Design a protein around this ligand. Structure first.
Ligand SMILES: OC[C@H]1O[C@H](O[C@H]2[C@@H](O)[C@H](O)[C@@H](CO)O[C@@H]2O)[C@@H](O)[C@@H](O)[C@@H]1O
Ligand SMILES: OC[C@H]1O[C@H](O[C@H]2[C@@H](O)[C@H](O)[C@@H](CO)O[C@@H]2O)[C@@H](O)[C@@H](O)[C@@H]1O
Ligand SMILES: OC[C@H]1O[C@H](O[C@H]2[C@@H](O)[C@H](O)[C@@H](CO)O[C@@H]2O)[C@@H](O)[C@@H](O)[C@@H]1O
Length: 114
């Protein structure tokens, strides 16, 4: 069970690497752009096995999965992807930067996941 996670505004796909950097890039079909959810709230990179993670300041990264609440996420049917600990939502821009912000209703915070 795995998905891609595509930004509604930019079309770029959520992606990450072995350094733990998280960014978006145009779709390339590679496994760094796939993500798996084993049903514990985690979102794990298909290639690196590292968990999507974020902090109260809004930085986004991946780390080996550590069981904490910062690595848990809620996927809403309207496209928000919300961090369970902080309540901020996954967000990104035209340059490929990824971060979290309070929900603002803008399209950069909407994601298509499947
Ligand atoms: O050749 C490595 C890698 O290149 C392409 O993936 C890019 C990006 O999606 C990845 O996050 C980083 C991982 O370091 O590398 C590239 O910038 C894809 O062709 C991918 O399938 C490939 O394995
Ligand atoms: O620092 C306590 C914190 O550590 C671990 O979480 C790490 C990372 O997953 C978090 O995103 C950042 C948030 O600032 O903190 C750590 O680097 C977990 O053990 C977590 O439960 C705990 O609160
Ligand atoms: O007015 C710009 C933009 O502002 C709000 O979006 C913010 C953030 O969610 C976005 O990721 C970045 C993209 O560069 O911009 C802001 O920081 C939203 O109101 C959005 O609709 C709006 O275009």
């Amino acid at each position: 069970a795995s998905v891609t996670i595509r930004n509604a505004q930019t079309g770029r796909l959520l992606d990450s690497n072995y350094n733990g950097n998280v960014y978006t890039l145009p779709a390339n079909g590679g496994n760094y752009q796939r993500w798996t959810g084993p049903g514990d709230g985690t979102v794990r990179n298909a290639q690196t096995g590292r968990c999507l993670d974020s902090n109260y300041d809004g930085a986004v990264y991946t780390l080996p999965c550590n069981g904490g609440s910062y690595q848990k996420w809620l996927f809403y049917s309207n496209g928000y992807i919300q961090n369970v600990e902080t309540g901020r939502v996954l967000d990104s821009n035209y340059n490929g930067n990824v971060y979290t912000l309070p929900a603002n209703g803008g399209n950069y915070q909407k994601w298509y996941t499947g």
